[PDB]
């Protein structure tokens, strides 16, 4: 009975910007998911296509938890079939998409006097990201029809935007650690199964 | 359109039990998810009670669990909040949310503490538990 | 030189609710404008069909005061062309409008501890308000099928709804006085005109 | 409609900042474009507006004088210039497309209000510290 490392993708001092979402793959463990829906610490809790209480009992080949920290009103855009920058140009959902969306809040963690500048989610993409697609390039952006040639200038801007990040932010600007579970049953074999 | 008349509320000695009964028109309220949300003055909603699956699985936050009980009556198509064990410190306005329905959505259990989150808002109802009244 | 009695207007101890506007005809008097653009003590100020720099120079048969206290979220609903409930069933104003509508912040006067719960808009209307009509009956709403018989009950509930109105309450929850000037040239003779 | 900030950071106490908003897909001169201030844990303040079509300004008592609205038709971006920056002024600013002059009767148009504003940009962070 090896218990699947559900603490250490949530429980991480180190979580990824939204701009470069860290996906760590899940197999070959009996998963535990009572833990997740008993306790009262996440904020929002979502669950796309699947029953939380029924997960025990069904089986998946592979889960995939994607971890990013995001804004309060950012938590909103990343969901099925919803519309958002955060959703256009960072982190996208497919419409059929069969998983839970698990948020809770991190501002004593992630917030500093200073402000935490640390996080950089895209502002500027050419195109809408495909789903579960990630954009690490980091490549001025061209908006007028002059060339920027690489060089930041009028019209030119750096896809990267800080994240202000303030303790004394309002909670809609306070930082959110989400993490997004993914199950996939389409490999033949199923390995995580449950308890 | 949706529309949301929420009821009941007024002044609550410490302890008292009060009811709040939020009216839905023009949805079903069985198929979308409803959370009630407290908002204290100069700060933003907070959920408190929702209804997290189409089943009738509700969650209460840790401070209100036990104490309020959410019900939901289809007959009357109206969502009863029952608070129970008031104290001051719940002196709020209360929110009903309709919030995304389940038929149209691939979603079978949706809760949030996030006003934004939630589709739809209805008008806020004050609450107000004082001991000198 | 009689002034027109904008200070009245806008100085005022007591202001309408929401759902009875206080409308103050104006007429037969040197008004002067400089004093409502020159003062910075208004948040919002927007003029639709006018000028204000321009407003001394016309003169106008007749000029509409209506004053009442909102949320600083329903100041954006009161405009021409633009939805809201304060709109739709408490004061509506026609898309061809000429005139100015200014609020300014008024927490400190309008909010107390235990909260000001006076002033009363009209949640709930049978039919979107006209321009410029006042409704100020009090019979109970019928949303079901069921008749109300003038009784509160279920899928019955009273129009008004009260303002909390707390000291503490965030910018958009404080409450704001708003005075709306209404300039009607339709009348033949121009009385107020302005100061010379 | 997009709104691009450009400028902000560090400044010490006394010191001039220069903000711009870039404008697209929309005539900066037909809106009116507000500039606002967010303090953390505060609703966004008017600051500076531009109130008529003609360029005509209007400066909240508090950013008076040391602050300057200029558009730049060309460009299509509109142009914060702040001088003798104080602590007190470090927070979030935001720039406004506001209501259109042309399609609304709107001659004259200024709001302290978020809500009122149509379209609202990306914050941009600017801080003045003595200490650094
Ligand atoms: C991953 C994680 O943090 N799990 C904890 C668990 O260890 C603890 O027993 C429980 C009660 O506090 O809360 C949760
Ligand atoms: C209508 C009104 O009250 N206007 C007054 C004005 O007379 C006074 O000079 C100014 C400074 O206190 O404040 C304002």
């Not at chain 1, 001092?13 to 996906?23: E, G, H, L, P, Q």
């Not at chain 1, 980091?138 to 060089?151: F, H, K, L, R």
């Not at chain 2, 949706?2 to 609550?12: I, K």
């Not at chain 2, 023009?26 to 979308?32: A, I, P, S």
Request: hydrophobic letters at 30%; one cysteine or more; glycine letters at 10%.
């Amino acid at each position: 009975t090896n218990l699947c490392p559900f603490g250490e993708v949530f429980n991480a001092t180190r979580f990824a910007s939204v701009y470069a979402w860290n996906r760590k793959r899940i197999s070959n463990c009996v998963a535990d998911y009572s833990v997740l829906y008993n306790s009262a610490s996440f904020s929002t809790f979502k669950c796309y296509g699947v029953s939380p209480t029924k997960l025990n009992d069904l089986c998946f080949t592979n889960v995939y938890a994607d971890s990013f920290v995001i804004r309060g009103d950012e938590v909103r855009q990343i969901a099925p079939g919803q519309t958002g920058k955060i959703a256009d140009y960072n982190y996208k959902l497919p419409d059929d998409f069969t998983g839970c969306v698990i948020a809770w809040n991190s501002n004593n963690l992630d917030s500093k006097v200073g402000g935490n500048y640390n996080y950089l989610y895209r502002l500027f993409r050419k195109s809408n990201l495909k789903p579960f697609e990630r954009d690490i390039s980091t490549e001025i952006y061209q908006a007028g029809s002059t060339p920027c040639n690489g060089v930041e200038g009028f019209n030119c801007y750096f896809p990267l935007q800080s994240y202000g990040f303030q303790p004394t932010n309002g909670v809609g600007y306070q930082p959110y650690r989400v993490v997004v579970l993914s199950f996939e049953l389409l490999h033949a074999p199923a390995t995580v199964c449950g308890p | 359109q949706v529309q949301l008349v929420e009821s009941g509320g007024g002044l609550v000695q410490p302890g008292g039990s009060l009811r709040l009964s939020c009216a839905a028109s023009g949805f079903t309220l069985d198929d979308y998810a409803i959370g009630w949300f407290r908002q204290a003055p100069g700060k933003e909603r907070e959920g408190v009670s929702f209804i997290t699956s189409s089943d009738g699985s509700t969650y209460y936050v840790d401070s209100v669990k036990g104490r309020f009980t959410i019900s939901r009556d289809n007959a009357k198509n109206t969502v009863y909040l029952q608070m129970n064990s008031l104290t001051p410190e719940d002196t709020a306005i209360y929110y009903c949310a309709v919030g995304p329905s389940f038929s149209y959505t691939g979603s079978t259990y949706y809760r949030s503490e996030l006003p934004w989150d939630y589709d739809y808002w209805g008008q806020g109802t004050q609450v107000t538990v004082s001991s000198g009244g």
